Symmetry: C4
Subunit: 467 residues, 4 copies
């Protein structure tokens, strides 16, 4: 009579089972797939939220092996600039410089009559027209001569266009130019981040979100043109025709573009996304820390069941599932993977790190940052308006606005969390992320089983970095 | 051995499943049925409680698309007057006026020798006997003449009886009279509330409760005579013979009267109510916020199972179910509908609004209103007594007395709550209330699933209007 | 592999189902059986605990329709005296009196020369030897005569032996004597408590506990000789051979004595008690408010399942079940009955009433009384010792010592609680306790169902007498 | 689809069932097996943790009938010295003594011219070369003679080598020597601890842990050479090949050594340990009070199911199971045994006793001791380092550091806890630990059943010693 499918389960209803293992935590292999064609070094992506991911965090995350997704709550050029920033990220030097009109006396004023390498010569703005060296000047007496009658001319310089160049240097100092022969710096013949997630040309990978409303074409175009590695079409309802249509159109317009579509929480929803053309299915309706959808609307599916149901279909097409929302501890990452996901998307876990947007706030002598639902009033009010234009029709939010404890640097957080994954892989005898994802077993536990799992019956005196 | 049917479920044991959808929240259709013949524009009715619904709230609710139920804790004429108030609600002007005995000097005292429209002329009390205009007087010198020798006489006036009249005006100012030609105002040729729930003649709908005890005939009669749209026979035990008898008698006496009977919590109970003649089955034994029945008596049925069981029968006769009690958030409304209800009856959700009875109370520098069970001592003590008459026989209450946070205006609350319904209809791909009610699917969740549903693991900094 | 029977259930896991009803709460019939041959007017007995039941409460409870069980933590004669007190409870007057040696002047000193009824004449100690009346003296001048030469002699008095006598009075004042013709008072030709639980001779019923250890014979004998109506052999383990043996012996020694045996929590245990000869099976291992057995020992059975299992057997022999422990609200009484019990035994519910032993304690400006497990250290330390005698062998308690809020008078508590029963009987359409016990149905509910049952989502401003 | 075995259960999900019993708590038999060949007098062992077990507690526990396991967070010789200490524990006297060079005047200086037993004579360091008695001196005048010309020579002494000797005394005072004839004390012809757990030669039993990393051979060798009764190879992952290999090697090197291996939480894991050669299977992955494994890694198995699954296999080979972690109250011990374990290993239950390592700490005017996971940062930092050597590679802890309330003496704790076991054995009619372990039955209970089990609805005024 009551129309009810079986009991759906979330992270706290299950525990993974230990198994025979020849795997040590530090030998565990963390590599996995974000989409059919994009590899991750760690099974983490960052949420596309104005309180989690801008260029700063996207770069830091990619350096550690994951991919950040730039949020859409900014203008097109703003978003494209963010992507571009990530794509060109290098860490070049930017030397002291003179004019073709400046005199030798000007130069001697700078050098202080003791030897020097040289000064790149630049025009009114900002053309590079030569160089003057400690050997061009050592024996020039006439302090009145302009730098241009004694400089090494344009053609004797060794240069590169911005964007490894270390190949062309095989000469040991090279001047970076652009398309109008305009100086941008210098690089002088000299791996900090071996787990970096990078594209075929050794650039850091980045993603960016656009959402499903009509009229996104201009935004998509600019993001692809800025070299985005993966496009996320993010919606609170991936099973909506609107979303499927938007995915179809984007697939048809960029047949090689890796696209993530979601969110869904069912087999059917994962099926309709795959049919629309996604390269990856993003799963989660309502499990997010800052989410009130389940309460406001009554709709949702516990996240371990949502994952397994979406993966049941997505596996049949070779399509990876992304588990998005509700990850609170590193043991949830293990569980989301064993349920069928190839990686997890996280907000709160990364929010409040140094790298996330926003400044630190003090509240009762303790450190926090802003963290808010993308569907909260504040996140939505940066709507398209200016409130000058906007106003019986008030928005009904499905997210809250809050504060989250300051976490410090992203790198240490990732290391803490992946530690716990590695240890689970040793416990479950999973060599690779695939083995955890396809072979690990669960048991179902009661509320009393979950209390035994936590710390219990002792006073914690010190905070542990993973708990 | 132990006599036990299956596990019964309440709101927090279930979540609705998202589905393929061509529905947008703002295109969702909220219309539904209160009874076999009365349509609602929104699936909400207000509880019949002395701390929720009197004329004030009944009018405000009907203007928004629902129906209020006037409570019975007042005299017959009091209750009939409340219904009448709702039925005649308009928002007429009520102009300045003179006597047939008053002189022209009296008039000139009022006008101040500059032009005027006119003054309706009235008797000792309160008959209308004519009009005197700025053109009746402009050239009357004799300030001593009585208004009656120069007034426009009774028959040259254009008038209407109280109770659209805008048809007869096709003349642009019309004088409202009653049956003794007595003046009541004026209306001068001039839609704020398009979702208003209205009867075939464009009057706001209203309901009123009587309860099941013998001797209600006089009360019913007066309520029907006051134009009540729907009679509620409300009881803590709708499956009691007393209640069924009372419903039978009322059906026989008013074969066209829409009658709501309840409350029940079973198939059988819904069946016996339908057999007795109800136009709608009201469901809920014990789920109310202020209810202690379950604890005091040990009896009750979790409300999602109570709804589905009652709807299983009521569907077979085309009879709508009203889900009454236990609605706390807008997601519960979605759930109660998907379980089989056509609308929800709410107390606490509306209590504490400006429109509900009682004044605002301050308690520790914060705003509240009184909200009490109709079976609490205070609600019951307004019994029939005066305590002068009343007293080893003390009442045993099944409701408590309390306070509820001030909510502000009803209109904003309704908009907040229906927002969440609309969003669920988009999530579940339900175009109409019927589709949610008959096609949406649930999953069953654990206590851990319900914690994931809420906000979790972040500090809320601002209160969201729906949470 | 793990040796586990099905899920056992307690009060909060179930709710009763409303049903068709021709029963009104105030017409509900509360009468039930304590044992095969002893009727109760209300389905309550009081626990045999030194903080719940001594004569005071036993009398008050019997007057309301139940039976109190005097505890065993006192000497034999102490316990027999308590029983006796209950058995003889009447509410006699006790007039002013003179000596056969006292003079007329002594009498006139007392009367003050205005008329008087008379003075019963008594010996050195305390024999009754006659009467002197206002008419024996009115005309006796000689103030020196001793009362004995003018008294109405022994044989003209109308008298009764202690222990209705109102039959012999058919004469209107009668002098109460004992076996040595010794005066005890007077009763002068004059129903407050119609629900009183009484024996065939109109005396209040009382029970008394002895426990199962060897050597109880003397105690049993004295209790039977004091007119105890029902003997309780109370143990934390009724399925222990020791207990069954003790029951066997007592049955053989008093074939007509109603005996309660327990506690058990299984079919088997109820069977072995019946076989041993009990007139009633008492059920409950670990559910008591002050009990720590379940935690200390790991043993126990949730009380609704314990009841139904014990009743499954006990029903086949016509033997009533007593549900003992874990009753917190009046809805638990309804549930315990529907699970199969004929009445409930309560401790905390009665503890802290005026009538229970101990004085009121103030603790932070609020009223309490002592309430302790009979297996707590304090209850057990009144062992048999004096601590002078007693002491690597310390007792290991299965009960705690605590305080319970002052409740006031027992009568009001009973009325509050039976109110809730009556209302459940109306809700479930149970005319008699038997119908609730054998025909009412349960549903099983989740933790979320139990939260809906309570008060929720409102601030209680006043305490309700049943909640 | 989701890969899930049945619901696993922990202590609070179950209760034992009372049964027919001829067993009294004080007649219950507590003896059980630690391994195939080592008997315990009580079914308790202490955890191998630097905050629970060093020699002090190992000795106290063995005296009460259990076995302590010395932890490995110390050097080899340190650990061997601890074992040795336990093995030689006696409670000898150590008399006053003189030199062969000291004069009679020196002696008379000590005696004070009144009679004396005698003085054992010792060399430079520390050889025993004779004795001088109150009868050797009574008649020696020459105060200048050296003790050696008047002493009773080496050969007239009655002596024993360190390590019952009371047999050789059959002479009543005997001088304890070593292998270089060096004096160690004296024992003079004189059962406090009858439940002592002892080896075939009447020495207290002790265990010691080594862990599974390569290179443990030297440590094992020294522990065996120090007379360890049982070797524990303890790991957070007993199903890891590394652990199984280490067990294999140790079995092959010491075919008669009793070895405990673990921890596992499955049938398979218990099977692989038995195959590797263990004499006992230790069970528990994640249930420990101070454990965060379940949360950090997501892996674990509720402990009652982990026990029964491991015992299902281990029973088929006659191999005992040790239930390790998550024991909080004495009722958990009963449950762990009935689930299949032969004894329990405890940390927090013993931590904070006088005997456990560490000093008492005051924190807000109350007594505590340190208790920490062996996998917490602090426990692990005593790594092998000195931090001078050690440092993007920080450890990821699976244990926390905390404080636990001071418990007093271990003996009283054990007596409290075994009290509760004994009482359960009476309740379940289990004469021996074997009967509880193989015949007792469980019921499964809800969260509401567990609340009824606890104290509820009363204010505890005094702390009970077992709760
Ligand atoms: C896009 O971000 C999300 C996602 C991924 C999810 C939910 C959600 O509320 C939002 C924010 C809601 C927004 C931005 C409103 C616009 C819309 O999407 O129509 C959710 O409940 O599951 C998944
Ligand atoms: C007799 O009172 C009880 C009863 C009825 C129960 C329990 C209990 O602990 C005591 C007190 C325990 C005592 C007096 C110790 C003596 C003994 O009985 O051996 C329980 O857990 O279920 C039922
Ligand atoms: C050995 O002590 C344990 C045991 C028995 C268990 C766990 C645990 O974390 C530790 C401490 C973890 C350590 C010492 C890290 C070294 C390692 O073992 O690799 C657990 O979760 O179940 C059982
Ligand atoms: O306002 C919101 N309402 C509901 N879900 C949101 C909202 N904003 C973001 N989300 C989702 O919640 C996820 C983050 O969940 P978290 O890691 O548990 O903080 C995001 O990746 C989006 O899926
Ligand atoms: O005193 C009472 N006891 C139990 N139920 C009540 C009482 N008064 C009103 N009710 C019911 O509780 C409902 C309101 O529930 P609420 O919306 O959860 O506050 C009413 O519509 C009646 O069904
Ligand atoms: O010390 C004790 N330990 C366990 N049970 C007890 C103890 N003392 C009394 N009882 C039982 O607990 C019952 C009272 O339970 P209550 O009504 O829930 O307070 C008594 O009737 C006895 O069955
Ligand atoms: O740091 C740790 N993490 C997890 N388990 C631990 C750790 N240290 C000890 N243990 C285990 O926890 C047990 C003690 O559990 P307790 O009795 O519940 O305090 C030990 O016997 C080990 O099995
Ligand atoms: K949420
Ligand atoms: K309620
Ligand atoms: K209890
Ligand atoms: K734990």
């Amino acid at each position: 009579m009551l129309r009810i499918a079986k009991e759906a389960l979330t992270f706290d209803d299950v525990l993974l089972v230990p198994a025979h293992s020849t795997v040590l935590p530090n030998t565990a292999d963390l590599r996995t797939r974000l989409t059919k064609n994009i590899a991750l070094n760690i099974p983490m992506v960052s949420a596309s939220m104005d309180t989690v991911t801008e260029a700063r965090l996207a770069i830091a995350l990619a350096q550690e092996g994951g991919i950040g997704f730039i949020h859409k709550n900014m203008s097109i050029e703003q978003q494209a600039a963010q992507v571009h920033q990530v794509k060109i990220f290098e860490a070049v030097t930017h030397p002291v410089t003179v004019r073709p009109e400046q005199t030798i006396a000007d130069v001697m004023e700078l050098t202080h009559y003791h030897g020097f390498a040289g000064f790149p010569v630049v025009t009114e703005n900002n053309e590079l027209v030569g160089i003057i060296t400690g050997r061009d000047v050592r024996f020039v007496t006439d302090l009145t001569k302009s730098v241009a009658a004694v400089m090494t001319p344009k053609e004797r310089l060794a240069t590169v266009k911005e964007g490894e160049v270390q190949e062309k240097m095989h000469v040991e100092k090279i001047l970076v130019v652009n398309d109008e022969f305009q100086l941008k710096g210098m690089i002088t013949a000299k791996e900090s981040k071996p787990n970096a997630c990078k594209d075929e040309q050794g650039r850091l990978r980045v993603g960016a979100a656009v959402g499903a409303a009509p009229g996104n074409e201009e935004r998509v175009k600019a993001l692809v043109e800025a070299g985005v590695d993966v496009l996320l079409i993010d919606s609170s309802h991936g099973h909506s025709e609107g979303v499927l249509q938007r995915i179809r159109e984007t697939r048809a317009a960029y047949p090689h573009l890796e696209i993530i579509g979601g969110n869904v929480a069912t087999a059917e929803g994962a099926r309709a996304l795959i049919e629309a053309g996604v390269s990856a299915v993003k799963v989660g309706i309502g499990p997010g820390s800052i989410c009130t959808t389940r309460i406001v609307t009554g709709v949702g599916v516990p996240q371990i069941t949502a994952i397994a149901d979406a993966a049941g279909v997505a596996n049949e097409y070779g399509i990876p599932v992304i588990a998005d929302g509700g990850i609170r501890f590193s043991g949830d990452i293990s569980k989301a993977i064993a349920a069928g996901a190839s990686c997890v998307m996280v907000g709160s876990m990364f929010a409040g790190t140094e790298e996330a947007p926003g400044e630190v706030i003090l509240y009762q002598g303790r450190s926090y940052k802003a963290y808010r639902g993308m569907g909260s009033l504040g996140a939505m009010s940066k709507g398209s308006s200016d409130r000058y234009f906007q106003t019986a029709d008030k928005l009904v939010p499905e997210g809250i606005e809050g504060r989250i404890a300051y976490k410090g640097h992203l790198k240490e957080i990732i290391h803490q969390q992946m530690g716990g994954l590695r240890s689970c892989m040793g416990l479950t005898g999973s060599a690779t992320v695939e083995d955890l994802r396809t072979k690990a077993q669960f048991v179902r536990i009661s509320g009393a089983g979950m209390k035994e799992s936590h710390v219990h019956d002792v006073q914690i005196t010190k905070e542990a970095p993973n708990y």
